[PDB]
């Protein structure tokens with residue numbers, strides 16, 4: 001009944017955490033939304049703050065390693081950065097893979113966290129309309 005979308009970044013730090021937050025609110029009904037990383041770098045505090053600003057709570061989120069069982073059951077795996085795209089394991093033939101690249105806001109001014117957060121929102125809204 002419910003389909004599965006899996007957002008992947010290098011360390012499950014910011015872009016993938018914001019994608020999971022937006023995904024749960026926009027695609028909530030018929031979608032199970034998860035996020036993971038090749039490595040675990042912790043949840044960037046600025047990513048939590050960025051989502052709080054748009055009234056989305058991601059304070060309980062964890063930085064998790066990619067799981068083979070979630071990959072096998074995914075309808076769509078979305079990679080958000082180039083290293084994650086190349087390091088993602090070879091997927092089952094029935095699992096679709098898409099690369100939605102977004103700039104890394106880490107170490108940049110707060111305005112870049114705001115910008116990337118909103119670009120991710122628009123990409124997920126475009127996905128909902130498919």
Ligand SMILES: [K+]
Nearest residue numbers: 035036062064
């Ligand atoms: K996660």
